[PDB]
Each structure stands twice: as structure tokens, then as C-alpha cells.
Amino acid sequence: KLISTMPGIHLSPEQQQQQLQSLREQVRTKNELLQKYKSLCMFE
Amino acid sequence: NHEAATCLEDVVYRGDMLLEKIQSALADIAQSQLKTR
């Protein structure tokens, strides 16, 4: 169980639920800036 | 010497429209990383 402590309440499971959306938003905004950099035709 | 002014100013204008575009192509990603924070 002590081995099974470092998975657990180190970061609260409800807080884990909130930061899952934070990581998903991080992935999505990283992708968003990637296709904003790639998509625009800076050449005339 | 008249046409040398025109031949110089035309490639200056090629620099002018190119720098105006890429400084904006600098700018559009320059403030874009501000709101990334």
C-alpha cells in the first residue's frame, strides 16, 4: 500500500480531473499555434 | 545616372514590399506568443 501511495492523493484525484482538461487544453493550444504558424500564407 | 537611380530604387522597392511583409510575418507571430504567456 505504501508503494501504492505515490499513485494517489499526492495531487488530489478531483484536482487530477481538473488538470486532465489542463493537459488536454495544453495539447490543443500547442496544436493550435502549430497550424496557425503553418496555415498562413506569409508570402505574397 | 538617371536610370541608375531607377534601377536602384526598384530593387529597393523589392526590398520594401518584402520587408513590410516579413516584418508583419514577424509581427503576427510576435504578439501571438504574448497571449501564450
For chain B, helix, strand, coil in percent to 5 are 90, 0, 10
Experimental determination technique = cryo-EM
Backbone break loci in chain B, preceding residues, C–N > 2.5 A: none
Q: What is the resolution of this structure in A?
A: 8.2
How many whole angstroms separate alpha carbon A31 and alpha carbon A34?
A: 5
Question: Which amino acid is it at B37?
Answer: R
Shortest distance between the Cα of A26 and any Cα of chain B, in A, equals 10
Number of Cβ pairs < 8 A linking chain A and chain B: 14
Q: Are A30 and B7 in contact (CB under 8 A)?
A: no
Contact between A33 and B36 (Cβ < 8 Å): yes
CA distance B30 to chain A (A): 11
Rounded distance between C-alpha atoms, residue A21 and residue A14, angstroms: 12
Contact check, Cβ <8 Å, B17/A44: yes
Contact A35, B23 (CB under 8 A): no
Q: Which of A31, A41, A42 to mutate to test the interface with B (most CBs of B within 10 A)?
A: A42
Residue B17 contacts residue A44 (beta carbons within 8 Å): yes
Closest by Cα among B14, B18, B22 to A40: B22
